[PDB]
């Protein structure tokens, strides 16, 4: 029922991009939806890299939960908007690539951790503001 | 559904005609047509149609279902200023608070009480246990003791929680969806007492809301369990009735689930700004609530100024007495699954389709 | 440094939100 609606939304918006950024899957394996939003997500990643070089040090499940939760709760305590969801997505992807590249086997814990936070703390806002259709429109409007 | 127009959903047992009169006043000042509807299976239809961008601009229902509506991204957030918040009791705001944010406007507090025909019975039984005997008394006269809705668990829960039954454990500010008190000692004691009342031919498992209403109003039965909305038809019937405390079960009070009628704004509504106007400035005034209360009583309303008058009504005081002895419903999204499960168990135990222990074990599992 | 990253994520977030 609705447990599966939440799954497909999060996977299209969040998981697909992380798995591409991690090289768990190729660009060709991304849906047309995922290929579109990847552009605005890629540009956010570039814009972020020009500001800061994030150095991660995570050796356990708990460190991931605590650190990830601390960052993203401050990101949205103020408010929620699509631009910040872009940052949420990209942040999740960078922590996950650190894990896979460190070979610590924790990347699935980052994805899952971000999946759960988006599900409970962001999805109500996302859906009540047009959900998938509006994020795609947001990403196409940014193409200007 | 249509910009420039308001569509409002409220359950059929409330004063939708009174609310329509408040809609006419709103249309007089703004020219915005206000259509009040009372669809069937309302609490279920809204998440269906709202999820696809349709449904009403405004949805009315007890607060317990809104947390689920909010979590599904179906509700716009309301923006009442502190000034307006001060006109309603804080505890009513607490029933519509979810994940830090107000998600609906509270209207009025609702609780089940015991309603009895004074002529047929001038001394309501203090305990549930003395009912079977008082029923054989009345069934020799041609009457019956108690008829109330058996098809909705809302009306059976007070007896279920009496001896310890609970929905979700409340500890430190978080509800435990793992700790459920639907199949613990108290619950099966309360439900078994109901089945035995059925088995022993005192009540009828088929009894629903309309059946129990006509039986009482027509003086065919001495007692019923209901809320404030139902008093009007009893006034119309002219039965000499009292509203009082629910009977106790094994020395402990019936613990009814307290409801707070609430109004949410569909997230897909293109009329949110006008929905706010209607709800704050037209409905939640001494005049708007009176219009609705004259059609069907709301109970103890959230509006301080207007509740001050209503509180003096003894029928309202009994509602608050049974309310203190009860508990405010949680609004977490899991409340729907809990009701569905308890709805199936009560129906199966009464019909003999399942043992009490079977019915409740399934409900504990599926909560 | 962690609160620094969340501030940065906010700004460039709000930036991308307005530029759309
Ligand atoms: O005014 C309260 C309203 O609901 C009652 O109980 C409902 C409950 O509020 C809902 O959450 C639902 O899922 O479960 C209950 C029914 O088992 C009564 O149904 C109704 O008479 C009353 O108007």
| Resolution in units of Å | 2.4
Q: Which residues of B touch A132 (CB under 8 A)?
A: none
Token couple for B25:
């006043």
Answer yes or no: are the C-beta atoms of C9 and C17 closer than 8 Å. no
Cα(A125)–Cα(A117) distance, integer angstroms? 13
B317-330 b/e with 16+ CB inside 10 Å = b?
A: bbbbbbbebbbbbb
Beta bridge partners of B303: B88
CB of B63 closer than 6 A to ligand 1?
A: no
Closest CA to B283 of B310, B261, B259, B313: B261
For A19, B89, B328, B336, the CA distances from B62, given in Å and listed in that order, are 43, 16, 11, 12
Task: Tally Cβ neighbours within 10 Å of residue C20.
Answer: 18
- The answer, yes or no, to whether A and B have at least 3 beta-carbon pairs within 8 Å is yes
Q: Cα-flanking dihedrals φ and ψ of residue B316, to 5°? A: -70, -35
Closest CA to B248 of B129, B133, B346: B129
- Helix ranges (H only) for chain A are 2-10, 16-21, 32-51, 61-77, 82-102, 107-117, 123-128, 131-142
**Domains B5-110+258-328 and B113-255+334-366 alike in fold:** yes
Token couple for B189:
């004691």
Cα(B291)–Cα(B19) distance, integer angstroms? 7
Q: Is B17 exposed, middle or buried (0-12, 13-18, 19+ CB in 10 A)?
A: middle
Residue whose token pair is 């008082």: B134
Q: Which residues of A touch B75 (CB under 8 A)?
A: 128
Cα(A31)–Cα(A29) distance, integer angstroms? 7
For B16, B36, B83, B151, B229, the CA distances from B11, given in Å and listed in that order, are 8, 10, 29, 16, 11
Cα(B264)–Cα(B205) distance, integer angstroms? 35
Cα(B213)–Cα(A106) distance, integer angstroms? 61
User: If you ran DSSP here, which 8-state letter would residue C7 be given?
Assistant: H
Find which of C4, C10, C11, C13 to mutate to test the A interface (most A CBs within 10 Å of its CB): C13
For A60, B141, C8, the CA distances from A66, given in Å and listed in that order, are 10, 70, 19
Answer yes or no: are the C-beta atoms of A87 and A48 closer than 8 Å. yes
Q: Is A11 exposed, middle or buried (0-12, 13-18, 19+ CB in 10 A)?
A: middle
Q: Is A55 exposed, middle or buried (0-12, 13-18, 19+ CB in 10 A)?
A: exposed
For residue A77, the number of C-alpha atoms closer than 13 Å in the C-beta half-sphere is 9
Closest CA to B367 of B165, B174, B163: B165
Chain C contact for A17 (CB, 8 A cutoff): no
Contacts of B93 (CB under 8 A, 6+ apart): B85, B102, B106
What phi-psi label fits residue B80: left (phi over 0), alpha (psi between -120 and 50 degrees) or beta? beta
Cα(A7)–Cα(A13) distance, integer angstroms? 10
CB of B11 closer than 6 A to ligand 1?
A: yes
Topology of domain B113-255+334-366, CATH? D-Maltodextrin-Binding Protein; domain 2 (3.40.190)
Q: Where are the domains of chain B?
A: 5-110+258-328, 113-255+334-366
Say which experimental method was used.
X-ray
Answer yes or no: are the C-beta atoms of B7 and B35 closer than 8 Å. yes
Question: How far does CA B341 lie from the centroid of its chain?
Answer: 17
SS3 content of chain C, % helix, strand, coil (to 5): 85, 0, 15
Contact A84 C17 (CB under 8 A): yes
CB of B110 closer than 6 A to ligand 1?
A: yes
Cα angle A125-A128-A134, degrees, rounded to a multiple of 5: 90
Among B15, B152, B345, the mutation site with the greatest number of ligand 1 atoms within 8 A of its Cβ is B152
Whose alpha carbon is nearest atom 5 of ligand 1?
B154
Beta bridge partners of B328: B258
Cα angle B70-A3-A129, degrees, rounded to a multiple of 5: 40
Cα(B350)–Cα(B184) distance, integer angstroms? 18
Cα angle B315-B316-B322, degrees, rounded to a multiple of 5: 90
Contact B72 A2 (CB under 8 A): yes
Cα(B70)–Cα(A127) distance, integer angstroms? 10
CB of B296 closer than 6 A to ligand 1?
A: no
SS (H, E, C) chain B: CCCCEEEEECCCCCCHHHHHHHHHHHHHHHCCEEEEECCCCHHHHHHHHHHCCCCCCEEEEEHHHHHHHHHCCCEECCCCCHHHHCCECHHHHHHCEECCEECCEEEEEECCEEEEECCCCCCCCCEHHHHHHHHHHHHHHCCEEECCCCCCHHHCHHHHHHCCCEEEEECCCCEEEEEEECCCHHHHHHHHHHHHHHHCCCCCCCCCHHHHHHHHHCCCEEEEEECHHHHHHHHHHCCCEEEECCCEECCECCCCEEEEEEEEEECCCCCHHHHHHHHHHHHCCHHHHHHHHHHCCCCEECEHHHHHHHCCCHHHHHHHHHHHCCEECCCCCCHHHHHHHHHHHHHHHHCCCCCHHHHHHHHHHHC
Pick the CATH number of B5-110+258-328 from 3.40.50.720, 3.40.190.10, 3.40.50.1970, 3.40.47.10: 3.40.190.10
CB of B339 closer than 6 A to ligand 1?
A: yes
Answer yes or no: are the C-beta atoms of B182 and B167 closer than 8 Å. yes
Residue whose token pair is 């399942």: B354
Cα(A67)–Cα(A56) distance, integer angstroms? 10
């Amino acid at each position: 029922g609705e447990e599966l609606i939440y799954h497909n939304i999060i996977n299209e918006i969040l998981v697909g991009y992380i798995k591409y950024y991690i090289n768990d899957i190729s660009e060709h394996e991304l849906s047309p939806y995922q290929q579109q939003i990847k552009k605005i997500l890629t540009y956010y990643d570039e814009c972020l890299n020009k500001q800061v070089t994030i150095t991660f040090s995570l050796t356990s499940v708990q460190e991931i939960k605590t650190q990830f939760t601390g960052v993203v709760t401050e990101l949205f305590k103020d408010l929620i908007n699509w631009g910040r969801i872009c940052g949420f997505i990209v942040f999740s992807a960078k922590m996950a690539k650190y894990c896979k590249d460190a070979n610590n086997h924790l990347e699935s814990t980052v994805i899952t951790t971000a999946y759960n936070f988006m599900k409970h703390n962001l999805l109500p806002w996302m859906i009540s503001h047009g959900g998938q259709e509006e994020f795609l429109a947001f990403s196409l409007h940014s193409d200007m | 559904i249509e910009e420039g127009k308001l569509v409002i959903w409220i359950n059929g047992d409330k004063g939708y005609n009174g609310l329509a009169e408040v809609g006419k006043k709103f249309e007089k000042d703004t020219g915005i047509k206000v259509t009040v509807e009372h669809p069937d299976k309302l609490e279920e239809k809204f998440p269906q149609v709202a999820a696809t961008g349709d449904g009403p601009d405004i949805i009315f229902w007890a607060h317990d279902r809104f947390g689920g509506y909010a979590q599904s991204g179906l509700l716009a957030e309301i923006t009442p200023d502190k000034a307006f918040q001060d006109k309603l009791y804080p505890f009513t705001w607490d029933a519509v608070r979810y994940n830090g944010k107000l998600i609906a406007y509270p209207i009025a507090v609702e609780a089940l009480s015991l309603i009895y025909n004074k002529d047929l019975l001038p001394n309501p039984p203090k305990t549930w246990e003395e009912i079977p005997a008082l029923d054989k008394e009345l069934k020799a006269k041609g009457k019956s003791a108690l008829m109330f809705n058996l098809q909705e668990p809302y009306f059976t829960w007070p007896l279920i929680a009496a001896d310890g039954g609970y929905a979700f454990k409340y500890e430190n500010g978080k509800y435990d969806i793992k700790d459920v008190g639907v199949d613990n000692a108290g619950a099966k004691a309360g439900l078994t007492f109901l089945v035995d009342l059925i088995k022993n031919k005192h009540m009828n498992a088929d009894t629903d809301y309309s059946i129990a209403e006509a039986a009482f109003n027509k003086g065919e039965t001495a007692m019923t369990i209901n809320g404030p909305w139902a008093w009007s038809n009893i006034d119309t019937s002219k039965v000499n009735y009292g509203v009082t405390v629910l009977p106790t079960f094994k020395g402990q009070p019936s613990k009814p689930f307290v409801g707070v009628l609430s109004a949410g704004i569909n997230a897909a509504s293109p009329n949110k700004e006008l929905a706010k106007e209607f709800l704050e400035n037209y409905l939640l005034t001494d005049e708007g609530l009176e219009a609705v209360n004259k059609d069907k009583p709301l109970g103890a309303v959230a509006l301080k100024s207007y509740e001050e008058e209503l509180a003096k009504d003894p029928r309202i005081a009994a509602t608050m007495e049974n309310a203190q002895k009860g508990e405010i419903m949680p609004n977490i999204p899991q409340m729907s699954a809990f009701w569905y499960a308890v709805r199936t168990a009560v129906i199966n135990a009464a019909s003999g389709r399942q043992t009490v222990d079977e019915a409740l074990k399934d409900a504990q599992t599926n909560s | 440094t962690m609160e620094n990253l969340s501030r940065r994520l906010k700004v460039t977030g709000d930036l991308f939100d307005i530029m759309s």
